[PDB]
Amino acid sequence: VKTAETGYMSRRLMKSLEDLSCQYDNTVRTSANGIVQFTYGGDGLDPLE
Amino acid sequence: LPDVVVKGLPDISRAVINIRDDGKRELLVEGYGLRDVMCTDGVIGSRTTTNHVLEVFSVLGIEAARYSIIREINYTMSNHGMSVDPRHIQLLGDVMTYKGEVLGITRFGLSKMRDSVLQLASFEKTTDHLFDAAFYMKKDAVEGVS
Amino acid sequence: EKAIPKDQRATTPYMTKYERARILGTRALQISMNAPVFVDLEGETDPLRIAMKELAEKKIPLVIRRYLPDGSFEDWSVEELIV
Amino acid sequence: EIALFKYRKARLEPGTAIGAIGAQSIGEPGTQMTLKTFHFAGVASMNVT
Amino acid sequence: MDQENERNISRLWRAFRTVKEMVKDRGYFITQEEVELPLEDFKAKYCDSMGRPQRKMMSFQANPTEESISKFPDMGSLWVEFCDEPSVGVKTMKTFVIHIQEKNFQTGIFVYQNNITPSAMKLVPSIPPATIETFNEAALVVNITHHELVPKHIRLSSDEKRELLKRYRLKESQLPRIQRADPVALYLGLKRGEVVKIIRKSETSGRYASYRICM
Amino acid sequence: SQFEKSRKVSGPRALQPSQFGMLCTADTPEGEACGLVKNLALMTHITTDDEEEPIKKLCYVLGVEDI
Amino acid sequence: VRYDNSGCLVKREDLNKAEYVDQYDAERDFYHSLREYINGKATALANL
């Protein structure tokens, strides 16, 4: 029964966290340039690196 | 008559006092107040935290609602392993409440900022978001990836 | 709409991994349309492979226009950017 | 030199779709849930979700 | 019964602490003797000889502390009062509005007692320059700001808002919004178009600030 | 077996202890019909309604009164 | 350089804690942590 819910929470969470990218002024914004967070995580560090 | 209250708070089911690893005693209730519970003789109103996010939002505010939602997600995942490197949790706890109100991801939740009609047409209960978009005459500048 | 001059550039002087793949694909799409190369390539095919030889030598005649969200052009030539 | 190079490469690069990464990093550990009844209480005092 | 009059005077004393802390947080001159007075300086100062608390013996006036004048030229004094009846009708708040219009008060906050009638809420936009705030004595027992979860909210000036929007190259619409009738906003009295600064204390990074704008 | 709705079922898919020797405790399909489709064991027998008439007249002989 | 949100610089005796916590604070805190890590080696070398 888990195979019927393989992506239902991840697709609904993808509806809002989709058009967010960091601009060249180190600010993460939305598609309509409305700013949402001034620096990423309070420090601007990539959690991958 | 035999279910009329006498003394106590009306919106709390029960209460259990619990012992930690040290010699301290902490009570816990299962209610919904957080204002009349915080305004109680015997306890201190310095720190108390509930699971309900809207209960914190109605009493404490916007900025104290995101600081609880970045740790309630952190609590329901660190009890299994699976580190989700909490900057992701802080990004989740900021896109839900950057408008001045805590509204989640539901049918009435995707209408927080997205002016895009076709992005909002990728959800269930269709044939009602197109007609009011054609009635109120949305300008709908294409900017989103959807 | 205003173009930032060379002495007022405020962005990072490094090359992003997102702007390494687009400049390489644009160079490889130009080479596949019979553009003259500027590298001593060994005899081979696949313009995506001989565009990496130009990127490793830094002889690509392009620049990377970096737009800020009010119009702040900020030219940023490729050879100025280091890998 | 090592401590400055590993910090200067660690910043979040401009243009990273950081909403799409954060939306999949949360939902993908969500798809491995069994029942797993736990409790934030003593000897089976409360059933918490 | 005197048992209901021994601990219910500390219920109003703890709110009397919160009103002093709130008028201190606005940027008004208060001293470190009226906010740190013990129970011995409150029994024979505010209540009756029989044992009940008085009503009209709470109202005082606070002036700005000679630095917020330089930060804000268009700001004056307030006039905090206290109820006489458990349910405010007409004549007492008409006396309050005539008092504010008479003695040249730019604002004044009103502590309320038990339960709000709908005949008293249509008059709250009375004076277009001078606004008033309607609190509740059950919502002023505990203090919201230093709980565990509320960071340091700091109201900025019109000279500091101009420096913020020029440095980020923004407008007033891009900043994250905060609503009216919020327990952070009505504690500090934010108007429409005022940027507040928030100093968050996180774990992965530490201490960092952000900015909100009020609607 | 037939379901009512496939949203919040959660009940008729676990193995009941009351099918010991009646239904097969191993052979179930793997997929959407997991637990909804069952099998009989070896020594079982599904019965039929016989008469219902002489059993009621036999209880009255054994001592029960009419209602 | 730390600025107090209204133009010019901050005071010299206002750098530990203030109401003017700006950006570039995690970077200088990382620099102070690296200073503290280097100081831990010389302290052990002097104690040995």
Swiss-Prot record, chain C:
Described function: DNA-dependent RNA polymerases catalyze the transcription of DNA into RNA using the four ribonucleoside triphosphates as substrates. Common component of RNA polymerases I, II and III which synthesize ribosomal RNA precursors, mRNA precursors and many functional non-coding RNAs, and small RNAs, such as 5S rRNA and tRNAs, respectively. Pol II is the central component of the basal RNA polymerase II transcription machinery. RNA polymerases are composed of mobile elements that move relative to each other.
Top-rank taxon: Eukaryota
A Gene Ontology molecular function term of the record: DNA-directed RNA polymerase activity
Subunit structure comment from the entry: Component of the RNA polymerase I (Pol I), RNA polymerase II (Pol II) and RNA polymerase III (Pol III) complexes. Component of the RNA polymerase I (Pol I) complex consisting of 14 subunits: RPA135, RPA190, RPC40, RPA14, RPB5, RPO26, RPA43, RPB8, RPA12, RPB10, RPC19, RPC10, RPA49 and RPA34. The complex is composed of a horseshoe-shaped core containing ten subunits (RPA135, RPA190, RPB5, RPO26, RPB8, RPB10, RPC10, RPA12, RPC19 and RPC40) where RPA135 and RPA190 form the DNA-binding cleft.
Region (Leucine-zipper): 41-62
Protein's name according to its UniProt entry: DNA-directed RNA polymerases I, II, and III subunit RPABC2
Cellular compartments annotated: Cytoplasm; Nucleus
Keywords: Cytoplasm, DNA-directed RNA polymerase, Nucleus, Phosphoprotein, Ribosome biogenesis, Transcription
Residue numbers of the full-length protein present here: 71 to 153 of 155
Regions annotated as coiled coil: none
From Swiss-Prot, chain D:
Transmembrane stretches, start-end: none
Localisation: Nucleus
Function: DNA-dependent RNA polymerase catalyzes the transcription of DNA into RNA using the four ribonucleoside triphosphates as substrates. Largest and catalytic core component of RNA polymerase III which synthesizes small RNAs, such as 5S rRNA and tRNAs. Forms the polymerase active center together with the second largest subunit. A single-stranded DNA template strand of the promoter is positioned within the central active site cleft of Pol III.
More details: Present with 6020 molecules/cell in log phase SD medium.
Family: Belongs to the RNA polymerase beta' chain family.
Quaternary organization: Component of the RNA polymerase III (Pol III) complex consisting of 17 subunits.
Protein name, as recorded: DNA-directed RNA polymerase III subunit RPC1
Gene name of the encoded protein: RPO31
Swiss-Prot record, chain E:
Superkingdom, taxonomy of origin: Eukaryota
A Gene Ontology cellular-component term: RNA polymerase III complex
Record keywords, A-Z: DNA-binding, DNA-directed RNA polymerase, Nucleus, Ribosome biogenesis, Transcription
Record-annotated membrane-spanning stretches: none
Keyword DNA-binding among record annotations: yes
Protein localization: Nucleus
A GO molecular function held by the record: DNA-directed RNA polymerase activity
GO annotation, biological process: nucleolar large rRNA transcription by RNA polymerase I; ribosome biogenesis; RNA-templated transcription; termination of RNA polymerase I transcription; termination of RNA polymerase III transcription; transcription by RNA polymerase I; transcription by RNA polymerase II; transcription by RNA polymerase III
PROSITE patterns: RNA_POL_H_23KD (PS01110)
Keyword presence, Lipid biosynthesis: no
Pfam families: RNA_pol_Rpb5_C, RNA_pol_Rpb5_N
Quaternary structure and interacting proteins, as annotated: Component of the RNA polymerase I (Pol I), RNA polymerase II (Pol II) and RNA polymerase III (Pol III) complexes. Component of the RNA polymerase I (Pol I) complex consisting of 14 subunits: RPA135, RPA190, RPC40, RPA14, RPB5, RPO26, RPA43, RPB8, RPA12, RPB10, RPC19, RPC10, RPA49 and RPA34. The complex is composed of a horseshoe-shaped core containing ten subunits (RPA135, RPA190, RPB5, RPO26, RPB8, RPB10, RPC10, RPA12, RPC19 and RPC40) where RPA135 and RPA190 form the DNA-binding cleft.
Family from the record: Belongs to the archaeal Rpo5/eukaryotic RPB5 RNA polymerase subunit family.
Protein name: DNA-directed RNA polymerases I, II, and III subunit RPABC1
Taxonomic lineage: Eukaryota, Fungi, Dikarya, Ascomycota, Saccharomycotina
Swiss-Prot record, chain G:
Coiled coil: none
Top-level taxon in the UniProt lineage: Eukaryota
Subcellular compartments: Nucleus
Family under the similarity heading: Belongs to the RNA polymerase beta' chain family.
Note: Present with 6020 molecules/cell in log phase SD medium.
Subunit structure, interactors included: Component of the RNA polymerase III (Pol III) complex consisting of 17 subunits.
Biological function: DNA-dependent RNA polymerase catalyzes the transcription of DNA into RNA using the four ribonucleoside triphosphates as substrates. Largest and catalytic core component of RNA polymerase III which synthesizes small RNAs, such as 5S rRNA and tRNAs. Forms the polymerase active center together with the second largest subunit. A single-stranded DNA template strand of the promoter is positioned within the central active site cleft of Pol III.
The protein's name: DNA-directed RNA polymerase III subunit RPC1
Originating organism: Saccharomyces cerevisiae (strain ATCC 204508 / S288c)
